[PDB]
């Protein structure tokens, strides 16, 4: 609101928080992101390094749907499925191992972060990591692919 502004406290205050030596003139520097090479250089070079120039390779027309691929970490599969499906098993005595469609919860790829609880699993996913492989194997249980 208007009421809670400095401009209220700057009346009778001649130059208006803006200096009477060098006034508030219109557009001293330039207009917007202007003088990046020349003379505003010191910002752009010290504060946004790697702005000026090309790099890399075009992929031109590009569509993200083509390369949609979310990630999950082992870390939290023992979320995706209702926690009761874990409490059931860890127990049960038959080596059930519940199935986890990392598909069905919304992730085109599973990755090996974190601990995994000592508990056999069947993870059906798309693009598994290596480490995700190893951890699941080394716990017990398996890595099934989906198309």
């Amino acid at each position: 609101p208007s009421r809670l502004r400095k401009t209220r406290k700057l009346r009778g205050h001649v130059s208006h928080g803006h200096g009477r030596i060098g006034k508030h003139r219109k557009h001293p520097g330039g207009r917007g992101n202007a003088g990046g090479m020349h003379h505003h250089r010191i910002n752009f070079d010290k504060y946004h390094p790697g702005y000026f120039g090309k790099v890399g390779m075009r992929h031109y027309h590009l569509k993200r749907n083509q390369s949609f691929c979310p990630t999950v970490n082992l870390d939290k599969l023992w979320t995706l499925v209702s926690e009761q499906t874990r409490i059931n098993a860890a127990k049960n005595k038959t080596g059930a191992a519940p199935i986890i469609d990392v598909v069905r919860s919304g992730y085109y790829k599973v990755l090996g972060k974190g601990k995994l609880p000592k508990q056999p699993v069947i993870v059906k996913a798309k693009f598994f990591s290596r480490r995700a492989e190893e951890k699941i194997k080394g716990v017990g249980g398996a890595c099934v692919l989906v198309a």
Binding site: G30, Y51, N65, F68, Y108, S129, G141, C143, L145
Partner: protein
Amino acid sequence: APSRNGMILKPHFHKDWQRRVATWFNQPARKIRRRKARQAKARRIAPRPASGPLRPVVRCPTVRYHTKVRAGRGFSLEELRVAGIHKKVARTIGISVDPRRRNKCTESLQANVQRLKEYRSKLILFPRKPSAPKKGDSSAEELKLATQLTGPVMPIRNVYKREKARVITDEEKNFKAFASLRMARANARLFGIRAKRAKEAAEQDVEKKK
């Protein structure tokens, strides 16, 4: 004139946003303009599914989106000769006909056929005249209803089937699922080059012979 850490910002107001600004103080009166259509259309077509005709189960395209399903435009043609519904009749019976779908699989064909088979069965064909003959459903199955279907006819919900826990045979537990991806992605990589060498090596067996 930037000062000490921000972003760059290419705000695009160098043109003339000012003239062509649409504010939206229609929004709520529009909400209501709309209400009165939804409303009126229903009272006009009294017994008829308010939402609109029956529309097919259909799979979303691009790779990310795969696992979803939709109300499609309309049921295919191939689909109908199968359900035994004439395409020009369907259009009068509140059955939505796209006639522009390449049907590729028996899975999504019969899935989508079952919707028509379902529809027939729970459809009260309200007869041409009052004193009318065949195919119109009887004065009992007629009195019972005046019922507009509020909401989308036979709504398409993305439903999955649970897989019970298993035993994990020592065979699922051997498959190195990472390795086999890398294999896959290299055989698909080089399938073509590899084929040029069979084509050259088959050339050398004839070129050594001559």
